[PDB]
Amino acid sequence: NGTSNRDWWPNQLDLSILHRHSSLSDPMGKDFNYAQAFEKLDLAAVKRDLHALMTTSQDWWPADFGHYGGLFIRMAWHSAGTYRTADGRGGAGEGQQRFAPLNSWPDNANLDKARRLLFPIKQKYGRAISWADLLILTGNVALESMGFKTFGFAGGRADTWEPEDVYWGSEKIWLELSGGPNSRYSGDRQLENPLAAVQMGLIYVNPEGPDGNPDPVAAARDIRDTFARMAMNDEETVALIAGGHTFGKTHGAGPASNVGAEPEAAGIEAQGLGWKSAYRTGKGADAITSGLEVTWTTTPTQWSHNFFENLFGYEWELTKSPAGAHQWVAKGADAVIPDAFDPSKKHRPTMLTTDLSLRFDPAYEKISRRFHENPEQFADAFARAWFKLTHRDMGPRARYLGPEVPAEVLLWQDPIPAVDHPLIDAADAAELKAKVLASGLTVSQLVSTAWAAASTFRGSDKRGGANGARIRLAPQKDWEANQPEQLAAVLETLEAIRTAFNGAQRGGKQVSLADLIVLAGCAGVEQAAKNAGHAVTVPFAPGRADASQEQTDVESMAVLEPVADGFRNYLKGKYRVPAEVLLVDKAQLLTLSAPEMTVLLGGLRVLGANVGQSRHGVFTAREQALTNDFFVNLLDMGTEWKPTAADADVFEGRDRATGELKWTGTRVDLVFGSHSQLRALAEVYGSADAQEKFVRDFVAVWNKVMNLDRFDLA
Amino acid sequence: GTSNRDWWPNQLDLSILHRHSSLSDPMGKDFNYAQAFEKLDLAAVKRDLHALMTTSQDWWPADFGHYGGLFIRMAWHSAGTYRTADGRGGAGEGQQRFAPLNSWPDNANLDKARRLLFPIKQKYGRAISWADLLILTGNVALESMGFKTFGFAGGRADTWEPEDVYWGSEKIWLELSGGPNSRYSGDRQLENPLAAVQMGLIYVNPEGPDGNPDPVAAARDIRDTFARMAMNDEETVALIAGGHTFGKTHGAGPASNVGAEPEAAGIEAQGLGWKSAYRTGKGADAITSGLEVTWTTTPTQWSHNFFENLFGYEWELTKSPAGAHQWVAKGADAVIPDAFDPSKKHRPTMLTTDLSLRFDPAYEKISRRFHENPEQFADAFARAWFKLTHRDMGPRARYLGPEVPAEVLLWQDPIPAVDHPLIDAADAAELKAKVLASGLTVSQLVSTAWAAASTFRGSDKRGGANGARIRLAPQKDWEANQPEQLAAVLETLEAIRTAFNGAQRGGKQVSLADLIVLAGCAGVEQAAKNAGHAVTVPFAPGRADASQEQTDVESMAVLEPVADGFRNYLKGKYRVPAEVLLVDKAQLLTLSAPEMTVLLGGLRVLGANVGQSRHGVFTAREQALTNDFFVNLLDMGTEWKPTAADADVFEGRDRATGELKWTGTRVDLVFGSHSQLRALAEVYGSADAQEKFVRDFVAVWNKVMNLDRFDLA
Ligand code: HEM
Ligand code: HEM
Ligand SMILES: NNC(=O)c1ccncc1
Ligand SMILES: [Cl-]
Ligand SMILES: [Cl-]
Ligand code: NA
Ligand code: NA
């Protein structure tokens, strides 16, 4: 009820997304290092306790079949299942299921119970196992307990301490069907990027069918699209759904109107739980979670091949659960499926609409039949897919901790070869920077190429960055933002330098192209500082390696293309989201604060890093010199700015007294003179005492970006 | 995009505790603004500001060729958002340059005033904060026009994001009272903590209450709002008449000409707003308030013409060119200069709220005294201007520069100078042992030191343990302080003090303020020992004891804790939920969410609750410093339900037997409910956390004890 700045100005940009996750909200000390904690955990001990928990039923949420394994597999699947390849946001890697909004999503109903069941284990091991690792490890132990051998497990997901700022959609009603005022669909059922779910508060798709219509073929279209938006192909998708639905059951014993407030809405006495139900005992046999009432197999607590036997072995009739939801029952079947609580009851086989998709979509049916005929193929596929699902956002294999990490390198990990030769030392770095500057490559070309290589990193899923030298490979070499023709010329010169240096060495010392691109960028920044009269050495850390084309999945790389990069004043097309919002989004992915974003952008503009050598925001008469000119000129009140008649998103800056044109700029350039918080930062850097501070802060942020993916040095 | 606040609009907001991280600050971690300021050539800055006064810019031409009135309004408004209820607002953080205050309707065209000052800010850089520059500029404006100010102190460090302040619940700018989110109830009772009559005003409406042009009624709103800003009748009259000696209002055409406020304006406006389509949009055509008044015959020179005109004319109700109600002198000649045309003159004019100074009977007495004795007027105005502009700066030890007034003012809650050697580490150890041998308990010691130190609030830097004001009126008799228990503790400590000071040589002595804090430190050490942990709690001497004569009792009243969740105390029944009031108190204390959480769970097991209430005392070893609050709060074997007698008190029963185990309030149980607070509770309730909990508790306790220690900056 107190009115806030977001109430008064709801379309203004939000910078607090860049300053979340401060050391203020973190209870652990500054020096806490979770990897080091984890590495001394007795992982086998934790696994024993998790095995014991499986069948330790608690009366406040009694275990179906006497075994929590299905509930825990669903919990871990949902932890990972929020992931979107568009921006890398979501996934299991930050344990965000325990914070709002995900703790209270309708699709996460009763997973508050699942997490609560794990607190005694959490408490016993304390800081040595994060919630984020614990949720995945529990799902793995559930599978092992029920007879499925997993492909492996890595720890190293540090806990976080507040909610992430993620765009989950614009709907203001949970579960709203398509076509409303804030619809996430347009056109021929085109889901808006970056979303990867069909309704607000769902993980991927609606189990009754698209917008509730129980058509398995149409549902399969939604399955395919959302799963692809979560990095899964058809084979992985079938394996995951059929694999998962080998276990456990759904819950829909009575009408959904019996279920009360989600956790964030519940009373303080609920002590963090939600969805309290007035139906009968509210739990156990009477539980209501989705509103469906399906049990897939004849042994829901044991790995089996019964899913596909049932799917293909019966014909299916449409029916309704006790809550009124659409679901399917096997025609003419006997009552062969066990009841979760009463040994004297058995049930006919049942399926969701979206399970039927696996049989009635023609591409899925071929895979399903293969898995039915070849169950060893199904098991192997499901094990690989479960590992990928649960590790997709963990980043390079260098982050993976503990004794159960799979040795097999997987293409989806964007793998980087091991380095098996001496690295360049400081004298060698100095020799190579001189050679780069004697080649004729310009500051603009050197800065632009390193920026292009390093700025693909995003902290949301720890993909991208300059390691691997993938800028030389498809598809990065051909991205428009990367200036393919310019890039090719710089890479040819750098590869000739490299060849010359490597051919002159002894021992096995060599420099990778990945390291040379970054070092060359560093030489450009040093040259730019010299051009401005400043003596600056830029730090450089060797050790990057070059990945091959065959180690580079081109379709998976596509999502890393910068379609909006304000740091290079680039926008690939016209978007509904304003460019300055896209700039803050990119800064968040790069892990930048607002001051770092500000310094970086103003430096890049005067170094010539704009795509196409655009003059928009180039507020200097000494381009390729590292100065604070961007800020001093942007803040000059002798210039008046107006949008152009040709293009409302480009602005002309004229002398206020004469009308003479002095500059042009975009929304990304001018926001720094408009937003009250951004302008306060620009004033610091545009003050007469600030040139050396600007240069030193620029070098620090430049080095930060160059090192974002260097978990080999963590 | 839909946010958590959208889905759950009533859920508690912890992000207010985590502002001002080193993430959002452009200056290095090691920047110290006092060190930069102390080397500023303040005289040179003032010479540049003096020259700016009469250097008109054509994008916002100077009225009368002089920006001094604009800048005095700018500085008044920077200071004028201050509220004594919570200390929030004021000029001390330079928040006029951030949302929402940069876009309040009462701050219209002060974007232009701040813009005029950027060349000077640019020249001097980090050596002068925006916060200090806005105030300095108002002083130089006054001095340039012939008024002697009382002084100036630097030291307001800049901030880098908006403050989270409750300004009201209205959703429309300037909404008149009586709407669905009215800030008035009863017989025109303004809701605490608010200190303005309408959302987006500084104090009152210049046309009269809700627009009704009755000076007598307006005076009641003036008196109420200004008292809520720490000003009495003399100060109020001096300030309004002082201010309105200078400059003019702006209302040349209809207000529908004036476009979006700065936070709403297009990107091309480059941080300015209120662009006007009326004629030239500026200068002679300017529209700010919509009133068109010029008070004196010399708007660029200090005078006593405000009161000569107020009392020398009778007044007629009239309307400005924008349609606002205002007053014009009956029968008068055209003696007031025009701001741009030297061939035009105007009749004297006044606002409804100016006329309050004559038609309220108490104001009229003061106004007539100042009219007859303009030297009294000048002195009252200079003192009130200093107070206004420094009220949120904190102890005088924060005051920087060569123009600091030597006079000590009662409103500063002054602390006497220390003129003797301080106790050393071995002395402190001796005194801690003497305190523990006296028979004072852990609960008594912790509760007394908490009581003394936790009056601090970082909003205006008032309060804290320095001064030993806990022994004086009114603190000694506040209910939350447990007056009879407190008196017993204080008598025991004063006997220890007397014994130790009587045994010394060389003039060494310990103040009661330091011994209160040290005794609390001994209690926390003892509690740790009771748990099996040997720890030393840090302690820094150098507090002094203030006298009763040096303590304004009425000004102290706003520091009374009516809600202190750290002592499970709520003085009465409020509309705002107790958990929200806990977060508000944590923000005032400058605590993060982790610090709040540790501190509360420790206080509960040390016996710090008012009245020895058992609510939240989730331990069987009270007075031992353990993490038992968290381990017991998180025990899923306990089921919690509100009591039938009181919905805000909960019983914790064994889930299997029904046996009563504990009771708690909303402040206790929020740590088990709120998803971010429960995550913190889980860290401190884990089996590996004993050592960490003790360490973190001692660190936040020491932070609280030192909040007012600017003598150690
Ligand atoms: C098209 C994709 C999917 C849909 C629409 C879907 C739908 C559902 C629904 C409606 C439930 C019932 C929740 C309740 O009422 O308790 C559920 C349960 C479950 N799902 Fe899925 N699912 C999908 C994919 C997955 C995947 C990929 C996994 C894991 C690999 C998985 C594993 C499980 C398990 C184990 C259960 C049983 C939970 C219990 O025993 O408590 N599902 N699924
Ligand atoms: C009851 C309290 C007060 C009310 C209702 C009030 C009202 C106003 C209004 C409506 C304006 C015209 C804004 C514009 O259209 O440009 C203004 C101007 C001004 N006020 Fe006040 N005021 C109050 C107190 C003060 C105080 C305490 C001071 C300072 C000590 C101050 C100093 C000024 C000055 C110098 C101007 C002239 C600005 C210029 O020349 O641009 N006022 N006042
Ligand atoms: N929403 N979460 C992210 O965007 C992110 C998380 C961690 N580092 C960079 C970005
Ligand atoms: Cl996320
Ligand atoms: Cl404030
Ligand atoms: Na992610
Ligand atoms: Na304040």
Q: Is A183 on the interface with B (CB under 8 A)?
A: no
**Strands of A296-345, DSSP E:** 316-320, 326-330, 337-338
DSSP H stretches of helix in B476-592? 483-502, 512-530, 553-556, 578-588
DSSP state of B23: T
The partner residue sitting opposite A25, judged by closest CB among B593, B640, B674, is B593
Give me B600's structure tokens. Answer: 């509360």
- Residue with token string 């020096």: A31
Residue A593 beta carbon below 6 angstroms from any ligand 3 atom: no
Name beta bridge partners: B576.
none
Q: Which residues have CB under 8 Å from B183's CB, separation 6+?
A: B168, B169, B170, B177, B190, B191, B194, B197, B199
- The C-alpha atoms of residue B609 and residue B569 are separated, in whole angstroms, by 7
Is the backbone of residue A363 left (phi > 0), alpha (psi -120 to 50) or beta?
Answer: alpha
List strands edge to edge, sheet with A661-666: A639-643, A650-655, A661-666
**Ligand number, closest to the Cα atom of A589:** 3
The partner residue sitting opposite B99, judged by closest CB among A266, A272, A676, is A676
User: Reduced to 3 states, what is the DSSP secondary structure of residue A504?
Assistant: coil
CA B175 to chain A, closest CA, distance in angstroms equals: 13
Q: Which residue of A has its CA nearest to B685?
A: A123
Give me A80's structure tokens. Answer: 């990972």
Contact A294, A327 (CB under 8 A): yes
Architecture of the structural domain at B168-372: Orthogonal Bundle (1.10)
- The C-alpha atoms of residue A446 and residue A524 are separated, in whole angstroms, by 5
Q: What are phi and psi of B639, to 5 degrees?
A: -105, 140
User: In chain B, which among 195-214 make CB contacts under 8 A with chain A?
Assistant: 199
Q: Which residues have CB under 8 Å from A24's CB, separation 6+?
A: B17, B18, B21, B592, B593
Residue-by-residue DSSP string for A220-270? HHHHHHHHHTTT--HHHHHHHHHHHTTS----BSS-GGGB---GGGS-GGG
- The C-alpha atoms of residue A498 and residue B86 are separated, in whole angstroms, by 65
- Residue with token string 């800003």: B229
- The C-alpha atoms of residue B667 and residue B567 are separated, in whole angstroms, by 10
| Intrachain domains A1-168+374-408 and A409-565+690-714 with the same fold | yes
| Dihedral Cα A180, A184, A189, A194, nearest 10 deg | 180
Contact B605, B684 (CB under 8 A): no
CA B244 to ligand 2 centroid distance, Å: 6
CA A545 to ligand 4 centroid distance, Å: 29
Q: Report whether the peptide linkage leading into residue B474 is cis, meaning its omega lies within 30 degrees of zero.
A: yes
Cβ-defined contact of B4 to A642 (cutoff 8 Å):
no
Single-letter residue type at B280: T
Give me B177's structure tokens. Answer: 């009272």
User: Reduced to 3 states, what is the DSSP secondary structure of residue A350?
Assistant: strand
- The C-alpha atoms of residue A282 and residue A253 are separated, in whole angstroms, by 9
Active site residue B77: yes
What angle, rounded to 10 degrees, do the helices at B352-359 and B233-243 form? 140
Question: What CATH fold (topology level) applies to the domain A169-373?
Answer: Peroxidase; domain 2 (1.10.420)
Q: What are phi and psi of B181, to 5 degrees?
A: -120, 45
Go through chain B and tell me how many residues it has: 713
Give me A526's structure tokens. Answer: 């040093």
Active-site position among A78, A391, A534, A616: A78
Give me B332's structure tokens. Answer: 């008068």
- The C-alpha atoms of residue A433 and residue A427 are separated, in whole angstroms, by 10
Nearest CA to ligand 3 atom 5: A460
- The C-alpha atoms of residue A80 and residue A72 are separated, in whole angstroms, by 13
- The C-alpha atoms of residue A110 and residue A74 are separated, in whole angstroms, by 10
User: Reduced to 3 states, what is the DSSP secondary structure of residue A33?
Assistant: coil
Cβ-defined contact of A119 to B688 (cutoff 8 Å):
no
Q: Is A18 on the interface with B (CB under 8 A)?
A: yes
- What angle is formed at CA A54 by the lines to CA A53 and CA A57, rounded to 5 degrees? 75
| Resolution for this experimental structure (Å) | 1.6
Contact B91, B119 (CB under 8 A): no
The partner residue sitting opposite A684, judged by closest CB among B26, B670, B680, is B26
User: Reduced to 3 states, what is the DSSP secondary structure of residue B641?
Assistant: strand
Give me B427's structure tokens. Answer: 């002395």
Cβ-defined contact of A268 to B684 (cutoff 8 Å):
no
Cβ-defined contact of B268 to A25 (cutoff 8 Å):
no
Question: What CATH fold (topology level) applies to the domain A409-565+690-714?
Answer: Peroxidase; domain 1 (1.10.520)
Instruction: Report domain extents, chain B.
Output: 1-167+373-407, 168-372, 408-564+689-713, 565-688
Give me A283's structure tokens. Answer: 């739990």
Name beta bridge partners: A666.
A650
User: Class for domain B1-167+373-407, per CATH?
Assistant: mainly alpha
DSSP state of A468: B
Per-residue burial over A588-620, b if 16 or more Cβ lie within 10 Å, else e, is bbbbbbbbbbbbbbbbbbbbbbbbeebebbbbb
- Residue with token string 């104001």: B363
User: Class for domain A1-168+374-408, per CATH?
Assistant: mainly alpha
Q: In whole angstroms, how far apart are CA B241 and each of A51, B227, B355, B358, B381?
A: 79, 17, 10, 11, 9
Single-letter residue type at A514: A
User: Reduced to 3 states, what is the DSSP secondary structure of residue B276?
Assistant: strand
- Residue with token string 């640019």: B122
Contact A215, A353 (CB under 8 A): yes
Contact A486, A448 (CB under 8 A): yes
Contact A263, A112 (CB under 8 A): yes
Residues in chain A within 8 Å Cβ distance of B21: 19, 22-24
User: Which of A60, A269, A697 is most worth mutating to test chain B (most B CB atoms within 10 A of its CB)?
Assistant: A269
Residue A290 beta carbon below 6 angstroms from any ligand 1 atom: yes
Question: Distance from CA of residue B476 to its chain's centroid?
Answer: 23
Per-residue burial over A371-406, b if 16 or more Cβ lie within 10 Å, else e, is bbeeeeebbebbbbbbbbbbbbbbbbbbbbbbebeb
Nearest CA to ligand 2 atom 31: B243
- What angle is formed at CA A526 by the lines to CA A523 and CA A529, rounded to 5 degrees? 150
Name beta bridge partners: B189.
B185
- The C-alpha atoms of residue A175 and residue A179 are separated, in whole angstroms, by 12
Give me B398's structure tokens. Answer: 């924060």
- The C-alpha atoms of residue B710 and residue B458 are separated, in whole angstroms, by 12
Residue ranges with CB less than 5 Å from ion ligand 5: B 88, 163, 165
Looking at domain B408-564+689-713, does it have CATH number 1.10.520.10?
yes
Cβ-defined contact of B126 to A687 (cutoff 8 Å):
yes
Burial of A576 (0-12, 13-18, 19+ CB in 10 A): exposed
What angle, rounded to 10 degrees, do the helices at B512-530 and B690-705 form? 170
Sign of CA dihedral A26, A29, A35, A37: negative
- The C-alpha atoms of residue B687 and residue B682 are separated, in whole angstroms, by 10
Q: In whole angstroms, how far apart are CA B533 and each of B201, B447, B618, B686?
A: 55, 21, 20, 18
**Residue A105: how many other CB atoms lie within 10 Å:** 23
Give me A148's structure tokens. Answer: 């499925």
Residues in chain B within 8 Å Cβ distance of A134: none
CA-nearest of A256, A388, A393 to A321 is A256
Name beta bridge partners: B545.
B467
- The C-alpha atoms of residue B280 and residue A605 are separated, in whole angstroms, by 36
Cβ-defined contact of B18 to A15 (cutoff 8 Å):
no
Q: What are phi and psi of B313, to 5 degrees?
A: -130, 155
Q: Is A594 on the interface with B (CB under 8 A)?
A: yes
Per-residue burial over B686-699, b if 16 or more Cβ lie within 10 Å, else e, is beebbebbbebbbe
Q: Is B115 on the interface with A (CB under 8 A)?
A: yes
Q: Which residues have CB under 8 Å from A629's CB, separation 6+?
A: A606, A619, A620, A621, A622
Go through chain A and tell me how many residues it has: 714
**Residue A568: how many other CB atoms lie within 10 Å:** 24
Looking at domain A566-689, does it have CATH number 1.10.420.10?
yes
Q: Which CATH code is given to the segment(s) B565-688?
A: 1.10.420.10
- The C-alpha atoms of residue B404 and residue B337 are separated, in whole angstroms, by 36
